[PDB]
Design a protein around this ligand. Structure first.
Ligand SMILES: [Mn+2]
Length: 1498
RNA sequence: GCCUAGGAUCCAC
RNA sequence: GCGCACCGGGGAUCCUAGGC
């Protein structure tokens, strides 16, 4: 099902023929195996001659450790003017490098009424009851202050104060004097305006009105105020005088916005040792308060707190937000003034001092250190323990430890971007160090453009550590030190994957995308859907030029790192592929056959175009773009730049003129100014259905509308809470909507609207209400509509793959979506299909270091790309060598690399530079128009090649969309530079390219060139080309020398193992081996494969897709996995976060990470949950695992281990029964009596009957009472919206099958959302309700027979006697009989894994201690279904679920038992875990920890 | 400019 | 003390009516 082009018209006229005849000009794909050898010998002779003479550069250098170390030392010798640094001096100046670091190592160190009043007012404000219009927060602060006054007069509860400021309702920290003066002014002005009443009276009345309105609104939605233990006695008849006469003396908090001198730090600088963990604990608390600084709602402000430019100097705190955090003997307040995630200025303040240190920061970057105060210490301890027995270093081990700790603390404190590329490039350095040859242009690629002082200090520390490890007299254990330095390098993963700045990264990415095209020689700009003849001529010219490359037979010789491919070498490659020369013997037998003889359902944000007429828009509108740019600069100046400058400034007057235009003459700017004026005037004149505002047409009480909006924004429509509104309001709203003919016909079907009609007529008032909401839900004065303008300038629109795919499927009525459909093309042209030329859209992934760009096309583009991808994949599958998809080939490559390193043979661990942009679809078209697969069959191969040619032709003429952000930024920069503001006179090539089109009209929207291959688009075609070219290169090398090479590659990589011949050659004659490597480089360049300067040749290591291998030992990437586990949390249900962390940690332990650290990672995750006020269930995580629990067991085995650890002596009498039960089920006794009489029956009364059915003693009466609290027992928790989702008690297995058959937030924002959910009515009642977790805790504490129990790790489980099992069935419904769930899971694993798990576990205690070195590994294999196997076996035990859930989503003798044993489980994934996530089959563990893992004998 | 009544904004994005 | 494509981020009030 590939060839389907015969349904369309060809229309290939005089252009496709030209491109075809281009790649047949000077190419001879018929050379025999002898002419090819002769030409290769000639080329090699000429190359060796011209390399000895010196007409060609060296390009490779033999490794000299001394020279490499010297270059790394003098890598940054223009600012770091030094060579050797004293370790003590480095330590000394580390603890003073920055505010955060100064604070980390400094020498520092009641149930009152104010808390009640503050919580009450916070709840009142959260509901958005009272419209803040005239200093409402002022009387809020007045109430809080009165509460505090009464409180202190009672017993002097000196909390909630900061010397002279107190914490207000939301989070605000207001000063006493300022609010006192404000109350004075307000009472005075009010008394004057209303003038008889005393000031005390006029204040108490103002308090009473607000309190009365708040209490009345609260006693309307069942939030009765008696819950909050408030006391309205605090409103004393003598209060105003009590306030004005109250005064607390202390300090005044401050925030410093400028770089303060290093003497105002009120504590001793360095007292904390690096060995201790107190610095990590301080960083943990500070990072926690910094992430919490994002949960503050953006309330209005009372006072301006400063005036004029002094508002960016040292600023006193009269009204600012404040987050508290404690340090082990004291408390501190992180004070700030802005709310959100954007970068802002914080300041730490104490109670006995003020403004300890202020610093700018970005809150959503400090997550990796939240509770990892003991994980990181153990990481450093293990890394030090690696190189600990090296006798050349034992004299100065403490310095190595100090440097490692300092590097970690530093990268955690300041997670800057360019402080990550340094630690990344350290890997390439240490790789080239131990090798034998490397690229001469290496050091010029390790240099990162460092900026701040902290980055230079980090470089200094790294340099000291390197020169301490890789010395010239430490030739003891190179493998351990290599692994140590590699892990130090991989420490870069501890920073973040995110981007510090969106626009700057998206512009650097566009510069990377645009520069090579401009430097190549030609670029088409703003192409039309019907390509112009000149554009076709330029494409043909660029085509004929792309083959014009030459080298080593010319005057100038070769020119390296320039895109293109020589006709001679392309002809050699095609001929050698047609002569069977590039065919191993295991492939000439099975002759190569041409491959001509829901699926996209994802969340890739596929693109979709806009249509203004019959044609679609392909160019931004110049006038609209400049209008939007000016509209942006207006908000930038008014909202922000107002309190920044004076008014006599030229730039200020120009910006204010532009603002008045939206809301000089002697420089040539008045002309352009009036042009912009008339343009924006035309735009404003040109800019002069159901929705949310329809709620205004229905609900009279605006407060109810505010509640509805708050719900809709906090939670999705589906989990809308019932008790947020009065019951009668639902029916009233439904009636009022249905009566309004307009809204009735806009939301109901009188002929989803059908569902609204049904639910209304059925009197399902809440259902009708939620349906209506779902249909609906889907500052400065502007003289026009700003949002429609902003959304009209854009050209493309993103969405989900599934949405557009379903729309296309509905419009059809894989290949069925692009050829047989109502919106199908008729006559594909030369450029592209009849629909129009292919179109992509630039993006970029978030990758450590640099960021690769991802192309995104619309549906037709994705389909036509997938056709070529599948064709070339099925083609490459016949040939051996590629490892992009074939996992078996990758494992073979790993085995070959291991064998090669074991023999100390030469290994070339290559990599290619700019593989994406340099490759081009024309190259693939040329290399495809010359191969012949089927030597005999020459009938259908021609048709297949013609089809693939006509597809690659379209892919050649593709047009890439320039992102809207970068074009807007360039337009604003152009406007500014036209005004003359900030003349730079540099004008990088990108800016020149943009301006050259801006100042002549048209704006660059779509760019098309012959040069770029979509990075990640043709990922398999490029892989096939790389395979077929590397095979020819190795064939040439074998033809010249007398050795062989075995190469593996996945589309950008190369691991080339050399035979013994090449190794002994490099041993004897270094010159010949070097010129061979150089000729290999030359060849790879001649075929458009530019070897990257990050490639090495050595006999010590071998990397492939970041999988290093040394002799004997194996190198784990400890810090990589630890950093991947530290920040890997989301805003999801806790039993899913736990499963994700468990999978991550399993993958980790399968790669050499010790378990003593994985336990600490799990403890950190549990602490992160405990902080969010969530109870810990036994089915969450087992933080006491061993080695066996990851190699033998699986997800559900460590759970059994944990439960056994919780309740010993009770699970034993259950395994005793389970052994006999498994024996009976395996011999084939019943196999159905159990699966029906006990799996579809009661729980405990059935459990005792089941265990007495066999010949074992039933459990004691005081064992069935052990139960665990299962929140979400009726319905899963309602999660607060952190991502817009694109468009009964269902068992978890059913939802897993649904997921398989078919814009999120950052990590820190996700953790904030998680902490916001748990504590905001997340649980759901039996039928439909909402309760706080604390309310359920209270309801459980009421019953004086329920006993809680907690383990040392903090796992909760309860003891509920049997007499309480009834009567009060409102809460007991949430408990589950732990023992029975343990039995169920144990049985579900005993038939998943072997029957061993039912044995009696015993710890190996007869084993004495061995002298365990921290580096000696042990390889192990795990102790060893499908999708339709489950779905064809589920309609037998629960056919109603099929008829209800799984039907529209379209034999094993024991799967029918397991697939039902997990349905009634509803406690943990049992078969879902093996159907959704594949277990790894190769583990590398510590041979010392295996000595302590338990034994589970049958 | 100030005061009063009402309307708008008052998780993160 | 953030970002560091030299361009960004770093303090929230607004509207209608009436009275002085
Ligand atoms: Mn590689």
């Amino acid at each position: 099902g590939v060839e389907s082009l015969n349904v369309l018209l060809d229309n290939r006229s005089s252009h496709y023929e030209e491109i075809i005849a281009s790649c047949h000009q000077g190419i001879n794909n018929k050379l025999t195996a002898h002419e090819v050898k002769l030409q290769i010998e000639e080329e090699y002779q000429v190359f060796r001659n011209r390399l000895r003479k010196g007409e060609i550069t060296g390009q490779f250098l033999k490794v000299d450790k001394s020279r490499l170390l010297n270059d790394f030392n003098n890598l940054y010798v223009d600012e770091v003017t030094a060579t050797k640094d004293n370790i003590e001096h480095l330590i000394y100046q580390f603890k003073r490098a920055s505010p955060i670091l100064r604070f980390l190592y400094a020498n520092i160190g009641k149930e009152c009424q104010m808390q009640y009043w503050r919580s009450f007012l916070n709840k009142v404000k959260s509901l958005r009851i009272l419209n803040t219009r005239r200093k409402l927060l002022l009387i809020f602060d007045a109430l809080i202050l009165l509460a505090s006054i009464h409180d202190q007069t009672r017993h002097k509860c000196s909390k909630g104060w900061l010397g002279s400021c107190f914490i207000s309702v939301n989070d605000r920290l207001v000063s006493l004097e300022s609010t006192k003066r404000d109350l004075e002014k307000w009472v005075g002005r009010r008394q004057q305006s209303e003038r008889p009443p005393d000031k005390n009276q006029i204040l108490i009345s103002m308090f009473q009105k607000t309190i009365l309105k708040a209490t009345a609104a609260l006693k309307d939605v069942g939030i009765s105020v008696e819950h909050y233990k408030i006391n309205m006695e605090v409103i004393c008849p003598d209060s105003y005088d009590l306030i004005l006469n109250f005064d607390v003396s202390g300090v005044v908090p401050t925030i410093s916005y400028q770089r303060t001198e290093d003497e105002k730090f009120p504590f001793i600088m360095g007292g904390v040792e690096l060995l201790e963990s107190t610095d990590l604990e301080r960083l943990s608390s500070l990072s926690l308060a910094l992430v919490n600084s994002m949960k503050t709602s953006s309330t209005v402000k009372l006072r301006q707190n400063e005036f004029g430019p002094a508002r960016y100097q040292v600023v006193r705190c009269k009204e600012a937000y404040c987050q508290e955090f404690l340090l082990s003997g004291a408390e501190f307040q992180l004070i700030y003034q802005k709310t959100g995630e954007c970068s802002k200025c914080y300041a730490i303040n104490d109670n006995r001092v003020g403004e300890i240190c202020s610093f700018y920061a970005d809150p959503k970057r400090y997550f990796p250190a939240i509770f990892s105060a003991e994980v990181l210490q153990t990481t450093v301890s293990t890394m030090i323990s690696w190189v600990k027995d090296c006798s050349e270093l034992e004299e100065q081990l403490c310095n190595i430890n100090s440097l490692t700790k300092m590097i970690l603390v530093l990268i955690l404190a300041h997670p800057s971007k360019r402080s990550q590329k340094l630690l990344q490039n350290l890997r390439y350095f240490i790789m080239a160090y131990v090798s034998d040859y490397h690229h001469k242009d290496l050091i010029d690629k390790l240099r990162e453009e460092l900026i701040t002082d902290v980055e230079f200090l980090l470089y200094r520390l790294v340099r000291a550590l390197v020169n301490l490890i890789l010395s010239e007299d430490v030739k003891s254990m190179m493998t351990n030190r290599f692994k140590f330095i590699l892990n130090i390098s991989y420490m870069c993963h501890f920073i973040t994957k995110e981007t510090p700045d969106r626009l700057t990264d998206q512009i650097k990415c566009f510069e990377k995308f645009l520069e090579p095209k401009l430097e190549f020689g030609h670029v088409s700009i703003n192409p039309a859907d019907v390509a112009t003849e000149e554009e076709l001529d330029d494409m043909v010219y660029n085509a004929k030029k792309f083959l014009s490359k030459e080298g080593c037979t010319s005057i100038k010789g070769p020119d390296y790192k320039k895109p293109g491919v020589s006709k001679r070498f392309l002809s050699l490659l095609t001929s050698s592929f047609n002569n069977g020369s590039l065919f191993k013997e295991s492939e000439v037998k099975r002759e190569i056959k041409d491959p001509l003889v829901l699926d996209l359902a994802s969340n890739k944000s596929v693109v979709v175009n806009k249509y203004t007429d019959g044609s679609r828009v392909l160019n931004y509108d110049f006038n609209k773009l400049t209008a939007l740019a000016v509209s942006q600069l207006t908000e930038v100046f008014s909202r922000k730049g107002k309190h920044l400058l004076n008014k006599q400034d030229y730039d200020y007057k120009v910006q204010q003129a532009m603002s008045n235009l939206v809301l000089l003459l002697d420089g040539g700017a008045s002309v352009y100014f009036d042009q912009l004026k008339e343009t924006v005037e035309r735009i404003i004149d040109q800019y002069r259905q159901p929705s949310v505002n329809d709620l205004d047409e229905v609900v009279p009480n605006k407060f109810y509308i505010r509640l509805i909006k708050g719900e809709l924004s906090n939670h999705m429509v589906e989990d809308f809470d019932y008790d947020v509104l009065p019951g009668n309001f639902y029916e009233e709203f439904c009636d009022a909507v249905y009566k309004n003919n307009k809204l009735k016909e806009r939301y109901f079907y009188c002929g989803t609207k059908a569902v609204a009609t049904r639910t209304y007529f059925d009197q399902e008032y809440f259902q009708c209400f939620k349906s209506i909401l779902l249909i609906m839900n889907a500052n400065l004065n502007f003289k026009f509509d700003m949002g429609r303008l902003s959304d009209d300038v854009r050209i493309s629109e993103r969405e989900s793959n599934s949405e557009a795919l379903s729309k296309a499927l509905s419009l059809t009525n894989l290949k069925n979506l692009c050829f047989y459909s109502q919106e199908s093309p008729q006559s594909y042209s030369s450029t592209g299909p009849d629909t129009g030329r292919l179109k992509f859209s630039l993006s970029y992934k978030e990758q450590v270091g640099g960021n690769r760009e991802l192309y995104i096309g619309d549906l037709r583009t994705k389909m036509f790309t997938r056709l070529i991808e599948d064709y070339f994949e099925a083609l490459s599958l016949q040939l051996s060598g590629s490892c992009l998809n074939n996992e078996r080939e990758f494992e073979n490559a790993i085995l070959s690399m291991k064998l090669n390193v074991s023999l100390a043979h030469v290994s070339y661990s290559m990599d290619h530079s700019k593989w994406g942009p340099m490759m081009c679809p024309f190259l693939f078209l040329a290399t495809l128009q010359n191969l012949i697969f089927l030597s005999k069959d020459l009938q259908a191969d021609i048709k297949g090649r013609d089809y693939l040619s006509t597809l690659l032709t379209w892919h050649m003429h593709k047009m890439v969309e320039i992102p809207f952000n970068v074009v807007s930024a360039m337009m604003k920069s152009f406007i500014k530079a036209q005004l003359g503001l900030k003349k730079k006179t540099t004008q990088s090539i990108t800016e020149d390219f943009f301006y050259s089109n801006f100042q002549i009209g048209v704006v660059p929207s779509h760019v098309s060139s012959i040069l770029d291959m979509g990075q990640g688009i043709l990922h398999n075609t490029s892989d096939f080309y790389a395979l077929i070219s590397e095979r020819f290169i190795n064939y040439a090398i074998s033809c010249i020398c007398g050795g062989t090479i075995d190469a593996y590659t996945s589309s950008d990589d190369q691991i080339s193992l050399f035979d013994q011949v090449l190794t002994e050659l490099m041993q004897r004659d270094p010159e010949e081996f070097k010129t061979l490597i150089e000729f290999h480089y030359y060849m790879s360049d001649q075929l458009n494969k530019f070897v990257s300067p990050k490639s090495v040749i050595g006999r010590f290591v071998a990397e492939f897709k970041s999988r290093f291998y040394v002799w004997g030992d194996e190198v784990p990437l400890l810090t990589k996995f630890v950093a991947a586990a530290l920040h890997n949390i989301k805003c999801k249900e806790p039993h899913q976060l736990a499963e994700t962390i468990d999978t991550i940690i399993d993958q980790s332990v399968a790669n050499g990470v010790p378990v003593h650290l994985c336990n600490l990672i799990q403890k950190r995750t549990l602490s992160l949950l405990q902080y969010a006020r969530y109870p810990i269930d036994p089915f969450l995580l087992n933080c006491e695992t061993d080695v066996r629990d990851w190699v033998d067991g699986n997800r559900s085995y460590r759970i059994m281990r944990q439960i056994e650890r919780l309740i010993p002596d009770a699970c034993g009498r259950i395994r005793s029964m389970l052994r006999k039960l498994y024996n009976k089920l395996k011999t084939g006794q019943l196999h159905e009596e159990f699966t029906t009489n006990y799996l579809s029956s009661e729980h405990l009364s059935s459990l005792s009957n089941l265990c007495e059915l066999l010949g074992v003693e039933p459990p004691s009466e005081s064992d069935l009472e052990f139960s665990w609290l299962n929140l979400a027992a009726h319905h899963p928790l309602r999660m607060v919206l952190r991502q817009k989702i694109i468009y009964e008690k269902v068992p978890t297995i059913v939802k897993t099958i649904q997921n398989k058959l078919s814009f999120q937030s950052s990590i820190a924002s996700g953790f904030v959302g998680l902490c916001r959910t748990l504590g905001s009515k997340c649980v759901r009642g039996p039928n439909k309700e909402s309760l706080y977790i604390k309310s359920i805790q209270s309801l459980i504490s009421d019953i004086q027979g329920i006993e809680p129990l907690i383990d040392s790790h903090g796992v909760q489980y309860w003891r509920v006697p049997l007499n309480i099992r009834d009567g009060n069935e409102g809460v007991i419904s949430y408990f589950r009989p732990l023992l029975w769930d343990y039995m169920c899971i144990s049985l579900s694993t005993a038939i998943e894994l072997g029957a061993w798990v039912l044995g009696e576990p015993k710890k190996v205690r007869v084993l004495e201690f061995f002298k365990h070195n921290p580096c000696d590994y042990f390889p192990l294999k795990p102790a060893a279904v499908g999708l339709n196997h489950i779905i064809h076996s589920l309609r037998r035990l629960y056919p109603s679920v099929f008829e209800k859930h799984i039907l529209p989503f379209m034999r094993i003798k024991f799967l029918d038992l397991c697939v039902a044993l997990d349905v009634n489980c509803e406690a943990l994934s049992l078969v879902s875990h093996i159907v959704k996530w594949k277990r790894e089959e190769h583990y590398i563990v510590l041979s010392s920890e295996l000595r302590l893992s338990h034994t589970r004998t049958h």
